[PDB]
Amino acid sequence: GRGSAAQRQGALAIMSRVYVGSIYYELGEDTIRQAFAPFGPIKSIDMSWDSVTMKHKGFAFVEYEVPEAAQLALEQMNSVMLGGRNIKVGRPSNQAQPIIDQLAEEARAFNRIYVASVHQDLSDDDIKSVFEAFGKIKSATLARDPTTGKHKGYGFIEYEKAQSSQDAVSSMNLFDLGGQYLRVGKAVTPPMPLL
Amino acid sequence: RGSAAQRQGALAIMSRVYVGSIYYELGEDTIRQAFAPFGPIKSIDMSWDSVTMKHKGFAFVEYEVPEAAQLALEQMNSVMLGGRNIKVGRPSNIQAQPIIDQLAEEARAFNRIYVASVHQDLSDDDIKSVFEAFGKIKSATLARDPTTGKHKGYGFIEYEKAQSSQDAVSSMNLFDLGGQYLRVGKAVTPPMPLL
Ligand SMILES: [Cl-]
């Protein structure tokens, strides 16, 4: 095999964060959150800060709950204009690369796609019906709050065939469902990566 | 929307991408090699600080067509060059935005895709045959040097149906053909934009 459970977890953590730069001085955490939340609920944000000037240094690190959200944010939020500036989005610059590469390779063995911006009223069966228009589905599951049981606005769908997942991503990314636009992309990690 | 002069000014802006966070040791040659897969580089405007006799860490790469800049923006952002994750964005200058928006809207009326990194040995009919696997094609044309008649490694393909063009982009971007990987994407301008 490759990567101790501990190594894999460290990689997953790094893969869940995106660097955001060129942030207008007047913009704060709440603006960033609003702009990046469509890709998955924000776990936390580490904003730069200067004690002498009493302001952030123009950049921040947004952390998501899963790697897939960071991947979509990276592909869709770069150069978007915020506060009059084109923000920059990238992967953290900080030995984890080989593990990250291994996870990406392992993910290709599944026809799994990540779906974000899922309206609160949609259920697992609702998402499944819609997405099975692209092909037979092995499983469709929305992530849920461990306490409430309410889904967190995102989930994963596994198809029996690769062509089905490819078609789904191409047709459903930015699809307007329930008033919001879904953010869809191929998985970048296998399911249960630390197993 | 916009006269011929306004549209051409927009097309010019749309053909350039900002490249930032360039390692001090890297020069024009490295940038060109890294960005050429999306279309042949027309020119590069590199920042310059003579006092220290070094560039300022950023440059503007100009392509022959807007589609190449679009692909470069979607595929080169955060790529690691010289140990640094480069940043790619649209020029911050631009009153041209409304015209750019108009061109994007007009482009959606055609099922046109841009194909870059086309090996020199491929011909128009070669490209057509390959791509017609996705659907009936109205035209497949590689851009050619006005003097030699040799294609410049890129072209445009128009499909009769939108689903065909969508399938082609999804299936052919990064497709290994003739030793290189094709760079494919939807057109961002209508054909003959200033007509
Ligand atoms: Cl080949």
Numbering used by the authors:
A (entry chain B): 114 to 207, 210 to 310
B (entry chain A): 115 to 208, 210 to 310
Report text from the authors:
Homologous to both U2AF65 and the yeast Mud2p, the Poly(U)-binding splicing factor 60 kDa (PUF60) shares domain features with U2AF65 by also containing two central RRMs and a C-terminal UHM. The most noticeable differences of domain structure between PUF60 and U2AF65 include the lack of the RS domain in PUF60 and a highly extended linker connecting the second RRM and UHM in PUF60. Although both U2AF65 and PUF60 are general splicing factors, the PUF60/U2AF65 ratio in cells influences alternative splicing patterns, suggesting PUF60 is implicated in alternative splicing. PUF60 appears to promote splicing at a weak 3’ splice site.
Herein is reported a 1.95 Å crystal structure of the two RRMs of PUF60 (PUF60 RRMs) in complex with a sequence from the adenovirus major late promoter (AdML) pre-mRNA 3’ splice site region (AdML3’). The structure reveals a homo-dimeric organization, where each participating PUF60 monomer captures a nucleic acid tract, and the PUF60 dimer places two nucleic acid tracts in antiparallel directionalities. Second, each monomer only binds to a short tract of nucleic acid using only the RRM1 but not the RRM2. Furthermore, the first position uracil bound to subunit A accepts a hydrogen bond from Lys-201 of subunit B, as discussed in the next section. RRM1 residues surrounding the uridine are shown in Fig 5, where Tyr-132 is the most outstanding feature that provides stacking for the uracil base. Therefore, UG is found bound to one subunit and UU bound to the other. Therefore, the bases of the wild-type sequence bound to the protein were assigned as U17-G18 on one side of the dimer, and UU from the polypyrimidine tract (PPT) on the other. Therefore, the looping in the wt dAdML3’ is deduced to occur between U17-G18 and the PPT. The Lys-201 side-chain from subunit B contacts U17 of dAdML3’, which is bound on the other side of the dimeric interface. This lysine donates a hydrogen bond to the 4-carbonyl oxygen of U17. The structure of dimeric PUF60 RRMs in complex with the AdML pre-mRNA 3’ ss region sequence suggests that PUF60 may also structure the pre-mRNA, albeit using a “looping” mechanism instead of “bending” as used by U2AF65.
